[PDB]
Amino acid sequence: NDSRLKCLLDPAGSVLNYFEPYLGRIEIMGGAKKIERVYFEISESSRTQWEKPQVKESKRQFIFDVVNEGGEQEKMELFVNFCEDTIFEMQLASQI
Amino acid sequence: LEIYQTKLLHYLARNFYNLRFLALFVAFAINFILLFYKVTEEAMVFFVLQESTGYMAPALRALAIIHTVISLVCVVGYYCLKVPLVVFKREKEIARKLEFDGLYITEQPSEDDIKGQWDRLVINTPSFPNNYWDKFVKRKVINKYGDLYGAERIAELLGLDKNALDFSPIDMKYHIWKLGVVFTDNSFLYLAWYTTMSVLGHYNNFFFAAHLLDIAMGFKTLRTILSSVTHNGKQLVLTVGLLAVVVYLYTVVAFNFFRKFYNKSEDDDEPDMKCDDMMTCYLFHMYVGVRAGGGIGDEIEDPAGDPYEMYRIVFDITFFFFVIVILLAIIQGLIIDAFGELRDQQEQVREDMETKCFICGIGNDYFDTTPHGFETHTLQEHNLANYLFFLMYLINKDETEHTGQESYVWKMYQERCWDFFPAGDCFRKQYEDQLG
Amino acid sequence: MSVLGHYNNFFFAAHLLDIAMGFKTLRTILSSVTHNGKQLVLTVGLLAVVVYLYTVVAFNFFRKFYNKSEDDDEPDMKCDDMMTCYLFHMYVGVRAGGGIGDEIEDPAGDPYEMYRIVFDITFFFFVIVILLAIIQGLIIDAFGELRDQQEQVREDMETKCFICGIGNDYFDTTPHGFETHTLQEHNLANYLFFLMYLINKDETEHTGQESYVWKMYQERCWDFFPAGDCFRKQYEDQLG
Ligand SMILES: [Zn+2]
Numbered sequence: 001n002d003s004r005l006k007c008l009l010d011p012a013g014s015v016l017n018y019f020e021p022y023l024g025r026i027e028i029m030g031g032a033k034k035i036e037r038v039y040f041e042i043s044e045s046s047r048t049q050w051e052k053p054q055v056k057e058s059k060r061q062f063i064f065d066v067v068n069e070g071g072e073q074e075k076m077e078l079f080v081n082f083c084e085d086t087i088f089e090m091q092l093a094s095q096i
Numbered sequence: 097l098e099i100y101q102t103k104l105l106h107y108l109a110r111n112f113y114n115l116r117f118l119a120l121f122v123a124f125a126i127n128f129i130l131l132f133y134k135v136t137e138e139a140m141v142f143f144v145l146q147e148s149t150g151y152m153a154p155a156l157r158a159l160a161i162i163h164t165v166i167s168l169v170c171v172v173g174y175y176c177l178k179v180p181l182v183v184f185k186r187e188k189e190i191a192r193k194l195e196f197d198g199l200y201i202t203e204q205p206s207e208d209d210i211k212g213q214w215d216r217l218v219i220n221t222p223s224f225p226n227n228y229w230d231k232f233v234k235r236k237v238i239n240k241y242g243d244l245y246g247a248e249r250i251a252e253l254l255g256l257d258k259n260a261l262d263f264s265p266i267d268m269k270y271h272i273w274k275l276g277v278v279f280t281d282n283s284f285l286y287l288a289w290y291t292t293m294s295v296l297g298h299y300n301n302f303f304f305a306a307h308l309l310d311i312a313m314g315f316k317t318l319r320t321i322l323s324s325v326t327h328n329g330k331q332l333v334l335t336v337g338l339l340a341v342v343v344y345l346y347t348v349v350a351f352n353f354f355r356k357f358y359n360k361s362e363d364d365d366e367p368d369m370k371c372d373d374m375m376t377c378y379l380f381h382m383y384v385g386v387r388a389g390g391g392i393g394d395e396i397e398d399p400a401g402d403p404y405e406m407y408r409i410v411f412d413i414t415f416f417f418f419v420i421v422i423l424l425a426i427i428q429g430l431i432i433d434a435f436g437e438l439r440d441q442q443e444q445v446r447e448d449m450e451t452k453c454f455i456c457g458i459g460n461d462y463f464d465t466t467p468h469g470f471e472t473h474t475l476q477e478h479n480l481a482n483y484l485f486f487l488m489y490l491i492n493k494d495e496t497e498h499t500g501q502e503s504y505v506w507k508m509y510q511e512r513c514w515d516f517f518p519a520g521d522c523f524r525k526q527y528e529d530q531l532g
Numbered sequence: 533m534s535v536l537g538h539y540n541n542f543f544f545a546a547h548l549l550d551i552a553m554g555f556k557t558l559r560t561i562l563s564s565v566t567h568n569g570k571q572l573v574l575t576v577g578l579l580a581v582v583v584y585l586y587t588v589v590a591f592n593f594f595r596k597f598y599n600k601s602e603d604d605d606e607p608d609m610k611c612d613d614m615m616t617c618y619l620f621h622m623y624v625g626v627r628a629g630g631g632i633g634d635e636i637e638d639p640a641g642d643p644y645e646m647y648r649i650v651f652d653i654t655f656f657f658f659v660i661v662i663l664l665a666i667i668q669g670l671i672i673d674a675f676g677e678l679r680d681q682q683e684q685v686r687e688d689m690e691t692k693c694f695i696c697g698i699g700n701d702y703f704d705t706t707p708h709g710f711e712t713h714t715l716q717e718h719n720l721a722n723y724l725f726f727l728m729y730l731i732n733k734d735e736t737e738h739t740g741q742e743s744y745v746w747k748m749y750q751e752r753c754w755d756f757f758p759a760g761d762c763f764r765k766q767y768e769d770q771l772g
C-alpha cells in the first residue's frame with residue numbers, strides 16, 4: 001500500500017522482467033511462529049531439466065501415488081523424498 | 097581414451113529409449129522375415145525360407161547381429177542412466193535407517209528382510225555413500241551413538257580408523273554390494289533376459305519371437321490396458337483355483353455315479369472310457385468340459401432312456417450354471433471393475449488437485465475471493481517446483497553462506513522435521529487484515 | 533456414392549450408414565465404441581502378437597496335429613509353413629468357442645499330450661476369455677465414463693455460478709436466491725446479448741461503461757467479467 005515504491009519500481013520494470021524466471025519464492029513457517037516468504041535463485045539449467053517430459057511424468061506419477069496410495073505416511077516426507085530423487089535425476093541429466 | 101570412453105558412455109545414456117525403440121523395430125522386422133519359413137522333408141526336417149528374391153536370409157543374419165548389438169548397448173546405457181538412481185535410493189534409505197533408527201547399532205534386521213542383511217555389507221566400506229550427497233553420515237551416527245555404545249566400536253563398525261576421527265599428526269566389497277543391488281532390479285533383469293533371448297536367437301531364429309512381448313513394455317497405452325488384468329490378478333488366480341476345486345468336485349461325482357456315459361469311442365471293438373480313473377476324468381473335465389459351450393453335457397453320452405437321467409440332467413445343468421455362466425462372469429467382472437477403479441482413481445486425483453492446495457491444504461473457496469486467487473496461490477505462492485528448486489538451492493550452497501532463514505530450514509531438514517512447511521496457513525491468511 | 537449408384541444400384545447400400553450420422557441416439561451409442569477406439573485397436577494388435585507366439589510354438593512342436601484332410605490320399609497340413617499356420621490360428625482359432633483345441637487333432641495317446649493340453653488351455657484362457665473380456669470391459673467403461681461426465685456437468689451447473697463461481701449456498705440465503713442470480717444477475721445469454729449489442733453499435737455512440745468493456749474486449753482482457761464477486765456481495769451491508 002505504498003505509492004512511492006510504485007513510483008520507484010517503474011524504472012526497474014525491465015530489470016524485474018529479466019529476473020522473473022530466475023527469482024523463486026516459497027513460504028515457510030519461520031522461527032517466530034509466523035509465515036515468512038523466502039526469495040532465492042533458480043538456475044536456468046534447473047528450469048530446463050525440470051520441464052523435461054520424463055520429469056513431468058515422474059511428477060504426475062508422484063501426485064497420483066500420494067493422492068491414492070499415500071496413506072500411513074506423512075505427505076511432506078514423501079514430497080521431500082520425491083524432491084531428492086528428482087534433484088539427483090536432474091543433476092545426472094545435466095552431467096551427461 | 098578416457099575422454100572417448102566418457103563421450104561413448106554419455107551418448108549411450110542419452111539415447112537409451114531411442115535404442116530400445118530401434119531394438120523393437122529390428123525385432124518386428126526379424127519376425128516379419130520369420131513369417132516366410134516352411135518345412136521341407138529333404139527323415140530329417142529342414143526349415144527353409146521360401147523366397148523369390150534371395151535377399152531375406154542375409155538380411156535375417158544381419159538383423160540378428162544388429163539386434164544383439166543393440167541389446168548389449170541398451171544394457172550398457174541402462175547401467176549409466178538408471179543404475180545411479182537405484183543406488184542413490186538404496187544408499188539414502190540405508191543412511192536414514194542407520195542414523196534415525198539405529199539399524200546396525202540399536203536394533204537388527206529381521207531374518208525375513210534380505211535387503212537389510214545384504215546392506216550390512218556396505219556400511220563399513222570407505223566408498224559408502226557414493227551417490228548420496230550426505231558425506232557426514234558416519235560422523236553423525238558416531239556422534240549420536242558413541243555416548244551409549246562406545247566411539248571405537250561404532251568406528252570399527254563404520255570402517256573408520258581411531259586416528260581418522262581426530263587429525264592425529266579399488267573397493268571390491270562395495271562393488272560386490274552394488275552388483276547385488278543391480279542384479280535384484282526388475283528393469284535390469286528384464287534387459288538381461290532380453291539380451292539372453294537375443295543371444296539365443298543365433299542358436300535358433302524363433303527365439304526372436306519373444307522380443308515382440310516388448311510391446312507390452314514399450315507403449316504406455318498397452319501398459320494401461322494390461323493394468324486392467326494385473327489390478328485384480330490375485331483374484332483372477334484365486335478364481336481359477338476355485339474353478340479347479342469345483343471341477344474336481346464334479347469329477348468325484350461323475351467318477352462315483354456316471355462312469356458309463358464317458359465312452360468316447362466310435363467303434364465297439366475298443367472302448368475309450370475317460371472316467372475309469374480319477375486322474376483321466378479330472379483332466380477330461382478340466383480340458384473338455386470347461387472349454388465346451390454348454391458344459392460337460394455337450395461332450396458325453398446322451399442320458400435319455402436311463403435310470404439316472406434326471407440326476408444327469410441336474411449334473412449337466414449345474415455344471416453349466418456354476419462353471420460356464422458364473423465363474424467366467426466373475427473373471428470378466430473383475431476385469432471391468434479394474435477398469436472402473438482405475439478411472440475412479442484418476443478422477444479422485446483430478447478433484448483433489450482442483451479443490452485444495454498440495455502444501456497447506458486450504459480449499460480453493462478461500463483463495464478464490466480474489467479473482468483467480470487459487471491459480472495465483474498454486475502458481476506463485478505455494479508452487480511445488482519452487483520448493484524443489486529451494487531444496488536444490490540449499491543443498492548446492494555452502495553452509496557458511498547460509499542466511500538465517502536458510503540455516504533454519506537447513507537445520508530442520510537435516511533432522512527430517514517438516515514443520516517449516518506451512519500446514520493450514522499461508523501468507524494471505526496471516527496478514528489478512530494488513531493486506532486487506 | 534449416389535452418382536455411382538447409377539453405374540450399379542447396390543452402391544446405394546452405403547447410404548444406410550447415414551443412420552449413424554442422422555440420429556443422436558445412435559451417435560451416443562457409437563460413442564461407446566469410439567471413446568476407447570485406440571485401446572480397442574491396441575487390444576486387437578496385442579491379440580495378433582499373442583496368436584503369433586502360439587503359432588511359433590505350434591509350428592516348432594505341434595505340426596502333426598494340423599491335418600485337416602478327411603482322406604489319407606492327400607493331406608491338408610495347415611502348419612507346414614508359418615504364414616499358413618498364422619492365418620489358420622488367426623482365422624479359425626480365434627472364432628472357435630474353445631480356442632485352437634476345438635479344430636485340431638485330438639492329442640490323446642501321444643508323447644506330447646500334456647504339452648498340447650497346456651497349449652490349448654492357455655490359448656483358451658488368454659485369448660478367448662481374457663482379451664475379449666478386455667474389449668467388452670472397454671465398451672462398458674466407455675458407457676460409464678460418459679454417464680459420469682454428464683453427471684459431473686449437472687452437479688457443476690447446479691452447485692456454482694458459471695460467471696463468478698460462487699456457490700449456491702451463499703445465494704440461497706434469500707429464498708430462491710441462486711435461481712434469481714443465475715436467471716437475472718449473471719445470465720449467460722445476457723452476456724452474449726451484450727457482446728452482440730456492443731459489436732453492432734457505433735464506437736462514437738458508446739457510453740463510458742460500453743467504451744470500457746469495448747477497449748478491454750479488443751485487447752482480449754477478461755478482467756471485466758466478475759470473478760468471485762457479485763452485486764450482492766459488494767453491497768451486502770447496504771442491501772441487507
Ligand atoms: Zn497452499
Ligand SMILES: [Zn+2]
Binds near residue numbers: 693696697698762
Ligand atoms: Zn455469478
